[PDB]
Amino acid sequence: AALKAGQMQKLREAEQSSKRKPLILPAPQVSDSELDEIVKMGMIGERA
Amino acid sequence: PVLQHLSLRNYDPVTRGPKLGFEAPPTENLNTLTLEEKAAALEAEARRKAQEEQEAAAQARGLDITTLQPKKPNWDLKREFKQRMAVLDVRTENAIARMVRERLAEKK
Amino acid sequence: KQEPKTQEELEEDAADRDRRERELREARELAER
Amino acid sequence: ARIIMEKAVKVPFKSVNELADMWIEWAEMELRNKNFDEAVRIMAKATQAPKRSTVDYFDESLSPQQRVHKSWKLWSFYVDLVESTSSLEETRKIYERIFELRIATPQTVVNYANLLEEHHYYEESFKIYERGLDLFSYPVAFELWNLYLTKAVDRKISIERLRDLFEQAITDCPPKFAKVLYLMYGNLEEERGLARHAMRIYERATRAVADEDRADMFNFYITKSASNFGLASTRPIYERAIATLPDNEARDMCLKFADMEKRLGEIDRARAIYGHASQFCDPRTNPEFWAKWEQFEVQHGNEDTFKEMLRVKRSVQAKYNTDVNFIASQALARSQM
Amino acid sequence: ERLFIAFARFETRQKEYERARAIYKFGLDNLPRSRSMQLHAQYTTFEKQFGDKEGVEDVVLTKRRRLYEEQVKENPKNYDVWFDFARLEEMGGDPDRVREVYERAIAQVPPTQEKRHWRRYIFLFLFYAIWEEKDAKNIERARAIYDTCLNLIPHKKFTFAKVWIAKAHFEIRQGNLTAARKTLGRAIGMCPKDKL
């Protein structure tokens, strides 16, 4: 029973590499230009 | 005479045969740091550094300005710039030095 | 304790030292000629 | 005595090690009586074979008088005697005879270069390391690569030479050495090169490492990208790691990605990340992830998102009601007790 | 190429080293570049395995130059690869090759008006000018390169104070204090910067 289930879980793992719906990440509400704006404002503050 | 007329690098006189690298590897005789135990050092360094940032994030309320951008981009290009400056600023300060000398020559 | 930062010169490869010695010997031979 | 032991050399003993013992005690008799050059001549007479000798050492059908030049005992004691007595040129000649005879060992290659390094011939030591690398295929050749790359970064040769040297080393490596090899090529690109170079090398290192240590390689890549650039640069590493990794490691990477997005504050993206993780997680086999999602929802969420998380939990739990997944669930349930 | 590979490795196995060098060189001469990459790689292995320092450096330089050219043809926007190829040419010691590589990198202008792309292009221009001044010793060429960089700099959009500082340092090294003051005044009028 253990070996038969080992074969079954090998087939399940073979299925596991193809059923992956890809991670459609949402667009962030902030873009990297504003991130750089935050970086240089914080740099100005810490330099002051 | 054997231990002063044999270099003891390839012959093992106790077994009346050659040295066994299986028994005695040359990896323990280096005065430097071999390539296997380094990168284990790098993995350990990254590991305890990473637990340091996760505990710093746990103890803090949120992001600081030095944890999302620890250093400004194109920093290594600037590192190359100052390693050229290591002689460029040397003869630049020699330049400003001797122009100080003639400027002091006309002001006197 | 601070380690003693002695002027550890880069140990030149003996091929380079032999090249310098050969150049010096060639210069001496040219001067003799 | 020399006459009768010359006759002993003429005796065809049963074992080649016996005639080896004859030759080594001949040189030993000579070195006790302060005849080192004579001993060198004696064992030069011992291993007299042409440049094209290929006889089998273990072939118990030829006389041991001829299949003794390929005995490692004579050659080892001989080259120690030459090293302790003669100059560097003769020892280099004798090692060259070793490498021609095709009986050399990785230990012998390391001994060649250590002899050169004691005499400060570093470039020829590099030459004999990579000659040994040419002779030995690769699961043998990892040790030579360790010593050679360590000494090459010790001497600090030209940067393009080191780049081509690691590209030679990485070429056909097993993953189990690829981890160390890529770790130092990225390390050297950080130390004496450019940062984006080291980033792309860590990327293809994640691409070309073993399955068991791929997750730790993405961990090193993530930590180095965070220490190097912004976390916005670390996002594409994260969704690539979700795309390529197996389910458990993808779960761990997805949880860390959700943690980073919650740290940045864009919890809508973190909620989508948690939804994807819930799509490839089982409630009755992985309860800690659902507990973490509920914790994230009670810190950041509402009753509508909580109802959505109940709906997704019920749908996923209904989806995984297959026979094999029930078998796995009961197996782990009775395994933890 | 595998015929030349096996023949050269055989003559290596017979320890006729110069003959193997002859096979390798003849193969690298009378073959196309697209069908000798394996031959070139085995030549580099043989040369830095058995040759001298100058030959090993030459073979590694040829292989690295070919690889960098292939990478540049694959993606001309990789300014890091262009900088590495320029550094390899500078270490090689060929001034014509260095000038050609600098001109080829200068021709690849940055299309986007981003600060990072402009910074990378300005850093490449500064490195090329520093290589021209330190090695080629052509002060007029360095001044022309600085003038071209200043003309190509979109000062109405983003100003690079480092380029102006480098031009002022080069003028101070050249002794033209009045020209340096005029350049500093023009830069301040175009864009006054706190670092400047």
PDB file of N, CA and C in Angstrom, chain B residues 1-2 4-11 16-21 24 26-27 30 32-36 38-39 42-43 45-46 50 57 62-64 67-71 73-77 79, chain D residues 21 24 28 31-32 36 72-73 76-77 79-81 83-84 95 107 110-111 114-115 118 142 145-147 149-150 180 183-184 187 194-196 216 220 223 226-231 263-264:
ATOM      1  N   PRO B   1      68.573   8.253   8.759  1.00  0.00           N
ATOM      2  CA  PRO B   1      68.737   9.233   7.669  1.00  0.00           C
ATOM      3  C   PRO B   1      67.477   9.523   6.861  1.00  0.00           C
ATOM      4  N   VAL B   2      66.472   8.638   6.898  1.00  0.00           N
ATOM      5  CA  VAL B   2      65.308   8.751   6.018  1.00  0.00           C
ATOM      6  C   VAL B   2      64.567  10.069   6.229  1.00  0.00           C
ATOM      7  N   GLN B   4      65.644  12.773   7.134  1.00  0.00           N
ATOM      8  CA  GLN B   4      66.377  13.919   6.624  1.00  0.00           C
ATOM      9  C   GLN B   4      66.883  13.733   5.204  1.00  0.00           C
ATOM     10  N   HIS B   5      66.573  12.619   4.546  1.00  0.00           N
ATOM     11  CA  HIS B   5      66.907  12.463   3.139  1.00  0.00           C
ATOM     12  C   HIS B   5      65.689  12.146   2.288  1.00  0.00           C
ATOM     13  N   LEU B   6      64.500  12.185   2.876  1.00  0.00           N
ATOM     14  CA  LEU B   6      63.249  12.141   2.140  1.00  0.00           C
ATOM     15  C   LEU B   6      62.429  13.370   2.493  1.00  0.00           C
ATOM     16  N   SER B   7      61.788  13.949   1.483  1.00  0.00           N
ATOM     17  CA  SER B   7      61.013  15.160   1.703  1.00  0.00           C
ATOM     18  C   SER B   7      59.697  14.901   2.416  1.00  0.00           C
ATOM     19  N   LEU B   8      59.306  13.630   2.570  1.00  0.00           N
ATOM     20  CA  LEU B   8      58.106  13.219   3.305  1.00  0.00           C
ATOM     21  C   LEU B   8      56.837  13.815   2.706  1.00  0.00           C
ATOM     22  N   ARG B   9      56.858  14.092   1.406  1.00  0.00           N
ATOM     23  CA  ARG B   9      55.705  14.653   0.717  1.00  0.00           C
ATOM     24  C   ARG B   9      54.958  13.620  -0.108  1.00  0.00           C
ATOM     25  N   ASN B  10      55.636  12.555  -0.529  1.00  0.00           N
ATOM     26  CA  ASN B  10      55.013  11.508  -1.316  1.00  0.00           C
ATOM     27  C   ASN B  10      55.240  10.110  -0.768  1.00  0.00           C
ATOM     28  N   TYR B  11      56.203   9.915   0.126  1.00  0.00           N
ATOM     29  CA  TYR B  11      56.501   8.599   0.673  1.00  0.00           C
ATOM     30  C   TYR B  11      56.153   8.559   2.153  1.00  0.00           C
ATOM     31  N   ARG B  16      55.962   1.779   4.797  1.00  0.00           N
ATOM     32  CA  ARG B  16      56.901   1.337   3.757  1.00  0.00           C
ATOM     33  C   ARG B  16      56.265   1.488   2.370  1.00  0.00           C
ATOM     34  N   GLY B  17      55.559   2.599   2.178  1.00  0.00           N
ATOM     35  CA  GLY B  17      54.863   2.854   0.941  1.00  0.00           C
ATOM     36  C   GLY B  17      54.627   4.331   0.710  1.00  0.00           C
ATOM     37  N   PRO B  18      53.829   4.661  -0.301  1.00  0.00           N
ATOM     38  CA  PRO B  18      53.542   6.068  -0.583  1.00  0.00           C
ATOM     39  C   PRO B  18      52.562   6.643   0.423  1.00  0.00           C
ATOM     40  N   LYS B  19      52.506   7.971   0.462  1.00  0.00           N
ATOM     41  CA  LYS B  19      51.522   8.636   1.301  1.00  0.00           C
ATOM     42  C   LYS B  19      50.126   8.424   0.736  1.00  0.00           C
ATOM     43  N   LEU B  20      49.169   8.192   1.625  1.00  0.00           N
ATOM     44  CA  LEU B  20      47.781   7.968   1.245  1.00  0.00           C
ATOM     45  C   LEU B  20      47.021   9.274   1.430  1.00  0.00           C
ATOM     46  N   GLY B  21      46.639   9.906   0.319  1.00  0.00           N
ATOM     47  CA  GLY B  21      45.785  11.076   0.402  1.00  0.00           C
ATOM     48  C   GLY B  21      44.390  10.767   0.900  1.00  0.00           C
ATOM     49  N   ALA B  24      45.366  10.857   4.632  1.00  0.00           N
ATOM     50  CA  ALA B  24      45.912  12.172   4.969  1.00  0.00           C
ATOM     51  C   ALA B  24      45.694  13.115   3.796  1.00  0.00           C
ATOM     52  N   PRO B  26      45.507  16.620   1.658  1.00  0.00           N
ATOM     53  CA  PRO B  26      46.261  17.875   1.728  1.00  0.00           C
ATOM     54  C   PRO B  26      45.414  19.088   2.070  1.00  0.00           C
ATOM     55  N   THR B  27      44.119  18.906   2.328  1.00  0.00           N
ATOM     56  CA  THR B  27      43.240  20.022   2.644  1.00  0.00           C
ATOM     57  C   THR B  27      43.468  20.592   4.038  1.00  0.00           C
ATOM     58  N   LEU B  30      46.851  23.567   4.528  1.00  0.00           N
ATOM     59  CA  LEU B  30      46.943  24.918   3.992  1.00  0.00           C
ATOM     60  C   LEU B  30      47.032  25.947   5.110  1.00  0.00           C
ATOM     61  N   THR B  32      45.980  28.893   4.389  1.00  0.00           N
ATOM     62  CA  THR B  32      44.907  29.772   3.953  1.00  0.00           C
ATOM     63  C   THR B  32      43.563  29.071   4.125  1.00  0.00           C
ATOM     64  N   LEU B  33      42.516  29.726   3.635  1.00  0.00           N
ATOM     65  CA  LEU B  33      41.143  29.290   3.844  1.00  0.00           C
ATOM     66  C   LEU B  33      40.650  28.601   2.577  1.00  0.00           C
ATOM     67  N   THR B  34      40.415  27.291   2.655  1.00  0.00           N
ATOM     68  CA  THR B  34      40.078  26.519   1.464  1.00  0.00           C
ATOM     69  C   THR B  34      38.668  26.854   0.984  1.00  0.00           C
ATOM     70  N   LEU B  35      38.394  26.501  -0.272  1.00  0.00           N
ATOM     71  CA  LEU B  35      37.192  26.968  -0.948  1.00  0.00           C
ATOM     72  C   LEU B  35      35.923  26.280  -0.459  1.00  0.00           C
ATOM     73  N   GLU B  36      36.032  25.207   0.322  1.00  0.00           N
ATOM     74  CA  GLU B  36      34.824  24.552   0.811  1.00  0.00           C
ATOM     75  C   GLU B  36      34.287  25.215   2.072  1.00  0.00           C
ATOM     76  N   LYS B  38      35.075  28.242   3.275  1.00  0.00           N
ATOM     77  CA  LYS B  38      34.509  29.485   2.794  1.00  0.00           C
ATOM     78  C   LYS B  38      33.376  29.148   1.833  1.00  0.00           C
ATOM     79  N   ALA B  39      32.387  30.049   1.793  1.00  0.00           N
ATOM     80  CA  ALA B  39      31.001  29.949   1.318  1.00  0.00           C
ATOM     81  C   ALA B  39      30.120  29.179   2.291  1.00  0.00           C
ATOM     82  N   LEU B  42      30.203  32.232   4.187  1.00  0.00           N
ATOM     83  CA  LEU B  42      29.290  33.196   3.573  1.00  0.00           C
ATOM     84  C   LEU B  42      27.832  32.845   3.845  1.00  0.00           C
ATOM     85  N   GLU B  43      27.488  31.552   3.812  1.00  0.00           N
ATOM     86  CA  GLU B  43      26.134  31.130   4.148  1.00  0.00           C
ATOM     87  C   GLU B  43      25.794  31.454   5.596  1.00  0.00           C
ATOM     88  N   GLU B  45      27.174  33.843   7.382  1.00  0.00           N
ATOM     89  CA  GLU B  45      27.101  35.298   7.470  1.00  0.00           C
ATOM     90  C   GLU B  45      25.750  35.807   6.991  1.00  0.00           C
ATOM     91  N   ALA B  46      25.300  35.318   5.834  1.00  0.00           N
ATOM     92  CA  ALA B  46      23.990  35.704   5.327  1.00  0.00           C
ATOM     93  C   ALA B  46      22.874  35.241   6.251  1.00  0.00           C
ATOM     94  N   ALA B  50      20.481  37.797   8.099  1.00  0.00           N
ATOM     95  CA  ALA B  50      19.060  37.765   7.769  1.00  0.00           C
ATOM     96  C   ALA B  50      18.200  37.685   9.020  1.00  0.00           C
ATOM     97  N   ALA B  57      12.994  44.134  11.936  1.00  0.00           N
ATOM     98  CA  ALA B  57      11.648  44.417  11.454  1.00  0.00           C
ATOM     99  C   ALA B  57      10.594  44.069  12.496  1.00  0.00           C
ATOM    100  N   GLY B  62       7.767  49.790  11.472  1.00  0.00           N
ATOM    101  CA  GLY B  62       7.692  49.818  10.032  1.00  0.00           C
ATOM    102  C   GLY B  62       9.044  50.102   9.420  1.00  0.00           C
ATOM    103  N   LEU B  63       9.010  50.559   8.173  1.00  0.00           N
ATOM    104  CA  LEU B  63      10.238  50.789   7.427  1.00  0.00           C
ATOM    105  C   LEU B  63      10.919  52.079   7.864  1.00  0.00           C
ATOM    106  N   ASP B  64      12.244  52.035   7.930  1.00  0.00           N
ATOM    107  CA  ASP B  64      13.068  53.229   8.002  1.00  0.00           C
ATOM    108  C   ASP B  64      13.680  53.487   6.631  1.00  0.00           C
ATOM    109  N   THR B  67      16.567  50.878   5.445  1.00  0.00           N
ATOM    110  CA  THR B  67      16.326  49.451   5.278  1.00  0.00           C
ATOM    111  C   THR B  67      15.699  49.081   3.944  1.00  0.00           C
ATOM    112  N   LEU B  68      15.044  50.015   3.252  1.00  0.00           N
ATOM    113  CA  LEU B  68      14.609  49.708   1.896  1.00  0.00           C
ATOM    114  C   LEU B  68      15.673  50.106   0.887  1.00  0.00           C
ATOM    115  N   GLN B  69      16.432  51.157   1.185  1.00  0.00           N
ATOM    116  CA  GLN B  69      17.551  51.601   0.359  1.00  0.00           C
ATOM    117  C   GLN B  69      18.744  51.761   1.289  1.00  0.00           C
ATOM    118  N   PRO B  70      19.448  50.668   1.598  1.00  0.00           N
ATOM    119  CA  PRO B  70      20.634  50.778   2.464  1.00  0.00           C
ATOM    120  C   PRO B  70      21.738  51.632   1.873  1.00  0.00           C
ATOM    121  N   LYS B  71      21.864  51.666   0.550  1.00  0.00           N
ATOM    122  CA  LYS B  71      22.841  52.519  -0.105  1.00  0.00           C
ATOM    123  C   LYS B  71      22.309  52.916  -1.471  1.00  0.00           C
ATOM    124  N   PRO B  73      21.946  53.695  -5.476  1.00  0.00           N
ATOM    125  CA  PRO B  73      22.303  52.880  -6.643  1.00  0.00           C
ATOM    126  C   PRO B  73      23.524  53.427  -7.364  1.00  0.00           C
ATOM    127  N   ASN B  74      24.078  52.576  -8.237  1.00  0.00           N
ATOM    128  CA  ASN B  74      25.331  52.834  -8.958  1.00  0.00           C
ATOM    129  C   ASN B  74      26.477  53.116  -7.989  1.00  0.00           C
ATOM    130  N   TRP B  75      26.460  52.437  -6.840  1.00  0.00           N
ATOM    131  CA  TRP B  75      27.481  52.672  -5.829  1.00  0.00           C
ATOM    132  C   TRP B  75      28.818  52.066  -6.229  1.00  0.00           C
ATOM    133  N   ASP B  76      28.799  50.924  -6.918  1.00  0.00           N
ATOM    134  CA  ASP B  76      30.041  50.286  -7.341  1.00  0.00           C
ATOM    135  C   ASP B  76      30.728  51.034  -8.482  1.00  0.00           C
ATOM    136  N   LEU B  77      29.959  51.690  -9.358  1.00  0.00           N
ATOM    137  CA  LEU B  77      30.571  52.602 -10.322  1.00  0.00           C
ATOM    138  C   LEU B  77      31.297  53.731  -9.605  1.00  0.00           C
ATOM    139  N   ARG B  79      32.550  53.390  -6.601  1.00  0.00           N
ATOM    140  CA  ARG B  79      33.725  52.745  -6.018  1.00  0.00           C
ATOM    141  C   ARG B  79      34.866  52.676  -7.023  1.00  0.00           C
TER     142      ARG B  79
ATOM    143  N   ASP D  21      60.556  -3.611  -3.254  1.00  0.00           N
ATOM    144  CA  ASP D  21      61.321  -3.615  -2.016  1.00  0.00           C
ATOM    145  C   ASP D  21      62.810  -3.734  -2.293  1.00  0.00           C
ATOM    146  N   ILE D  24      63.965  -0.207  -3.510  1.00  0.00           N
ATOM    147  CA  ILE D  24      64.004   0.794  -2.451  1.00  0.00           C
ATOM    148  C   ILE D  24      65.090   0.470  -1.430  1.00  0.00           C
ATOM    149  N   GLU D  28      68.257   2.637  -0.429  1.00  0.00           N
ATOM    150  CA  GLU D  28      68.377   2.875   1.001  1.00  0.00           C
ATOM    151  C   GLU D  28      69.785   2.524   1.484  1.00  0.00           C
ATOM    152  N   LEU D  31      71.959   5.337   0.357  1.00  0.00           N
ATOM    153  CA  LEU D  31      71.847   6.598   1.084  1.00  0.00           C
ATOM    154  C   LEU D  31      72.391   6.490   2.504  1.00  0.00           C
ATOM    155  N   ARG D  32      72.426   5.288   3.091  1.00  0.00           N
ATOM    156  CA  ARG D  32      73.114   5.159   4.375  1.00  0.00           C
ATOM    157  C   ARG D  32      74.619   5.345   4.232  1.00  0.00           C
ATOM    158  N   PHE D  36      74.205   9.451  -2.459  1.00  0.00           N
ATOM    159  CA  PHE D  36      72.893   9.921  -2.896  1.00  0.00           C
ATOM    160  C   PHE D  36      72.789   9.973  -4.416  1.00  0.00           C
ATOM    161  N   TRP D  72      53.783   2.705  -7.941  1.00  0.00           N
ATOM    162  CA  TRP D  72      53.777   4.015  -7.312  1.00  0.00           C
ATOM    163  C   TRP D  72      54.741   4.106  -6.138  1.00  0.00           C
ATOM    164  N   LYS D  73      55.145   2.970  -5.568  1.00  0.00           N
ATOM    165  CA  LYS D  73      56.057   2.987  -4.427  1.00  0.00           C
ATOM    166  C   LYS D  73      57.438   3.493  -4.827  1.00  0.00           C
ATOM    167  N   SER D  76      57.201   7.281  -5.798  1.00  0.00           N
ATOM    168  CA  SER D  76      57.021   8.166  -4.655  1.00  0.00           C
ATOM    169  C   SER D  76      58.318   8.322  -3.868  1.00  0.00           C
ATOM    170  N   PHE D  77      58.973   7.199  -3.542  1.00  0.00           N
ATOM    171  CA  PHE D  77      60.204   7.291  -2.760  1.00  0.00           C
ATOM    172  C   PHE D  77      61.314   7.944  -3.576  1.00  0.00           C
ATOM    173  N   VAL D  79      60.920  10.257  -5.963  1.00  0.00           N
ATOM    174  CA  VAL D  79      60.789  11.690  -6.141  1.00  0.00           C
ATOM    175  C   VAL D  79      60.983  12.411  -4.814  1.00  0.00           C
ATOM    176  N   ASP D  80      60.697  11.754  -3.683  1.00  0.00           N
ATOM    177  CA  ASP D  80      61.085  12.349  -2.407  1.00  0.00           C
ATOM    178  C   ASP D  80      62.602  12.411  -2.259  1.00  0.00           C
ATOM    179  N   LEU D  81      63.306  11.368  -2.704  1.00  0.00           N
ATOM    180  CA  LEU D  81      64.765  11.378  -2.655  1.00  0.00           C
ATOM    181  C   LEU D  81      65.347  12.462  -3.555  1.00  0.00           C
ATOM    182  N   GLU D  83      63.813  15.238  -4.532  1.00  0.00           N
ATOM    183  CA  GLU D  83      63.470  16.531  -3.949  1.00  0.00           C
ATOM    184  C   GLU D  83      64.377  16.874  -2.774  1.00  0.00           C
ATOM    185  N   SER D  84      64.700  15.893  -1.934  1.00  0.00           N
ATOM    186  CA  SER D  84      65.573  16.143  -0.797  1.00  0.00           C
ATOM    187  C   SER D  84      67.050  16.175  -1.160  1.00  0.00           C
ATOM    188  N   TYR D  95      58.614  14.530 -11.974  1.00  0.00           N
ATOM    189  CA  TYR D  95      57.168  14.748 -12.061  1.00  0.00           C
ATOM    190  C   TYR D  95      56.640  14.730 -13.492  1.00  0.00           C
ATOM    191  N   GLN D 107      46.546  14.191  -5.446  1.00  0.00           N
ATOM    192  CA  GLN D 107      47.564  14.471  -4.446  1.00  0.00           C
ATOM    193  C   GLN D 107      48.899  14.802  -5.100  1.00  0.00           C
ATOM    194  N   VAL D 110      48.725  18.373  -6.525  1.00  0.00           N
ATOM    195  CA  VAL D 110      48.864  19.323  -5.431  1.00  0.00           C
ATOM    196  C   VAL D 110      50.303  19.348  -4.932  1.00  0.00           C
ATOM    197  N   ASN D 111      50.982  18.201  -4.945  1.00  0.00           N
ATOM    198  CA  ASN D 111      52.380  18.163  -4.535  1.00  0.00           C
ATOM    199  C   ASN D 111      53.281  18.898  -5.522  1.00  0.00           C
ATOM    200  N   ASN D 114      52.646  22.594  -4.855  1.00  0.00           N
ATOM    201  CA  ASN D 114      53.181  23.006  -3.563  1.00  0.00           C
ATOM    202  C   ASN D 114      54.697  23.100  -3.611  1.00  0.00           C
ATOM    203  N   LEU D 115      55.339  22.189  -4.347  1.00  0.00           N
ATOM    204  CA  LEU D 115      56.771  22.301  -4.583  1.00  0.00           C
ATOM    205  C   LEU D 115      57.102  23.577  -5.341  1.00  0.00           C
ATOM    206  N   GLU D 118      56.530  26.678  -2.887  1.00  0.00           N
ATOM    207  CA  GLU D 118      57.625  26.872  -1.943  1.00  0.00           C
ATOM    208  C   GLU D 118      58.808  27.566  -2.601  1.00  0.00           C
ATOM    209  N   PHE D 142      36.825  18.450  -8.371  1.00  0.00           N
ATOM    210  CA  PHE D 142      36.351  19.516  -7.496  1.00  0.00           C
ATOM    211  C   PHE D 142      37.427  19.947  -6.510  1.00  0.00           C
ATOM    212  N   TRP D 145      39.783  22.213  -8.136  1.00  0.00           N
ATOM    213  CA  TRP D 145      39.145  23.507  -8.323  1.00  0.00           C
ATOM    214  C   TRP D 145      39.132  24.305  -7.032  1.00  0.00           C
ATOM    215  N   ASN D 146      38.918  23.631  -5.897  1.00  0.00           N
ATOM    216  CA  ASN D 146      38.978  24.308  -4.604  1.00  0.00           C
ATOM    217  C   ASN D 146      40.332  24.955  -4.385  1.00  0.00           C
ATOM    218  N   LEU D 147      41.396  24.162  -4.503  1.00  0.00           N
ATOM    219  CA  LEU D 147      42.727  24.694  -4.238  1.00  0.00           C
ATOM    220  C   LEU D 147      43.132  25.739  -5.271  1.00  0.00           C
ATOM    221  N   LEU D 149      41.190  27.746  -7.251  1.00  0.00           N
ATOM    222  CA  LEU D 149      40.460  28.999  -7.146  1.00  0.00           C
ATOM    223  C   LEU D 149      40.853  29.758  -5.889  1.00  0.00           C
ATOM    224  N   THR D 150      41.112  29.040  -4.788  1.00  0.00           N
ATOM    225  CA  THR D 150      41.586  29.699  -3.576  1.00  0.00           C
ATOM    226  C   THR D 150      42.929  30.386  -3.808  1.00  0.00           C
ATOM    227  N   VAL D 180      28.808  26.057  -4.303  1.00  0.00           N
ATOM    228  CA  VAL D 180      30.034  26.710  -3.844  1.00  0.00           C
ATOM    229  C   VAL D 180      30.652  27.541  -4.965  1.00  0.00           C
ATOM    230  N   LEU D 183      28.735  30.626  -5.592  1.00  0.00           N
ATOM    231  CA  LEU D 183      28.845  31.499  -4.430  1.00  0.00           C
ATOM    232  C   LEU D 183      30.125  32.322  -4.478  1.00  0.00           C
ATOM    233  N   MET D 184      31.252  31.690  -4.800  1.00  0.00           N
ATOM    234  CA  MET D 184      32.473  32.477  -4.992  1.00  0.00           C
ATOM    235  C   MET D 184      32.541  33.282  -6.278  1.00  0.00           C
ATOM    236  N   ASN D 187      30.676  36.192  -5.243  1.00  0.00           N
ATOM    237  CA  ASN D 187      31.429  36.882  -4.200  1.00  0.00           C
ATOM    238  C   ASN D 187      32.555  37.716  -4.790  1.00  0.00           C
ATOM    239  N   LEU D 194      31.420  44.298 -10.558  1.00  0.00           N
ATOM    240  CA  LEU D 194      30.208  45.098 -10.585  1.00  0.00           C
ATOM    241  C   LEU D 194      29.054  44.355  -9.922  1.00  0.00           C
ATOM    242  N   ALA D 195      28.123  45.137  -9.372  1.00  0.00           N
ATOM    243  CA  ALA D 195      27.039  44.573  -8.572  1.00  0.00           C
ATOM    244  C   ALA D 195      26.013  43.854  -9.439  1.00  0.00           C
ATOM    245  N   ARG D 196      25.641  44.452 -10.576  1.00  0.00           N
ATOM    246  CA  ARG D 196      24.648  43.827 -11.449  1.00  0.00           C
ATOM    247  C   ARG D 196      25.173  42.531 -12.053  1.00  0.00           C
ATOM    248  N   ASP D 216      17.548  27.646  -0.412  1.00  0.00           N
ATOM    249  CA  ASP D 216      18.595  28.413   0.250  1.00  0.00           C
ATOM    250  C   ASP D 216      19.317  29.329  -0.726  1.00  0.00           C
ATOM    251  N   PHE D 220      19.759  33.324  -0.336  1.00  0.00           N
ATOM    252  CA  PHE D 220      20.977  34.117  -0.470  1.00  0.00           C
ATOM    253  C   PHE D 220      20.807  35.213  -1.510  1.00  0.00           C
ATOM    254  N   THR D 223      18.607  37.977   0.106  1.00  0.00           N
ATOM    255  CA  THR D 223      19.343  38.760   1.094  1.00  0.00           C
ATOM    256  C   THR D 223      20.375  39.663   0.432  1.00  0.00           C
ATOM    257  N   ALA D 226      18.554  42.532  -1.327  1.00  0.00           N
ATOM    258  CA  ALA D 226      18.095  43.500  -0.338  1.00  0.00           C
ATOM    259  C   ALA D 226      19.248  44.342   0.187  1.00  0.00           C
ATOM    260  N   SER D 227      20.401  43.716   0.437  1.00  0.00           N
ATOM    261  CA  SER D 227      21.562  44.468   0.897  1.00  0.00           C
ATOM    262  C   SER D 227      22.132  45.348  -0.204  1.00  0.00           C
ATOM    263  N   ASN D 228      21.929  44.966  -1.463  1.00  0.00           N
ATOM    264  CA  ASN D 228      22.488  45.692  -2.596  1.00  0.00           C
ATOM    265  C   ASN D 228      21.548  46.784  -3.094  1.00  0.00           C
ATOM    266  N   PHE D 229      20.339  46.405  -3.499  1.00  0.00           N
ATOM    267  CA  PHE D 229      19.411  47.369  -4.072  1.00  0.00           C
ATOM    268  C   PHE D 229      18.107  47.413  -3.293  1.00  0.00           C
ATOM    269  N   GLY D 230      17.127  48.141  -3.820  1.00  0.00           N
ATOM    270  CA  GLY D 230      15.850  48.247  -3.154  1.00  0.00           C
ATOM    271  C   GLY D 230      15.047  46.965  -3.234  1.00  0.00           C
ATOM    272  N   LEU D 231      14.016  46.896  -2.392  1.00  0.00           N
ATOM    273  CA  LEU D 231      13.155  45.721  -2.363  1.00  0.00           C
ATOM    274  C   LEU D 231      12.311  45.603  -3.625  1.00  0.00           C
ATOM    275  N   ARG D 263       5.076  44.586   5.009  1.00  0.00           N
ATOM    276  CA  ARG D 263       6.042  45.558   5.511  1.00  0.00           C
ATOM    277  C   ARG D 263       5.998  46.847   4.701  1.00  0.00           C
ATOM    278  N   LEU D 264       5.865  46.732   3.379  1.00  0.00           N
ATOM    279  CA  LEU D 264       5.792  47.926   2.544  1.00  0.00           C
ATOM    280  C   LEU D 264       4.441  48.618   2.663  1.00  0.00           C
TER     281      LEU D 264
END
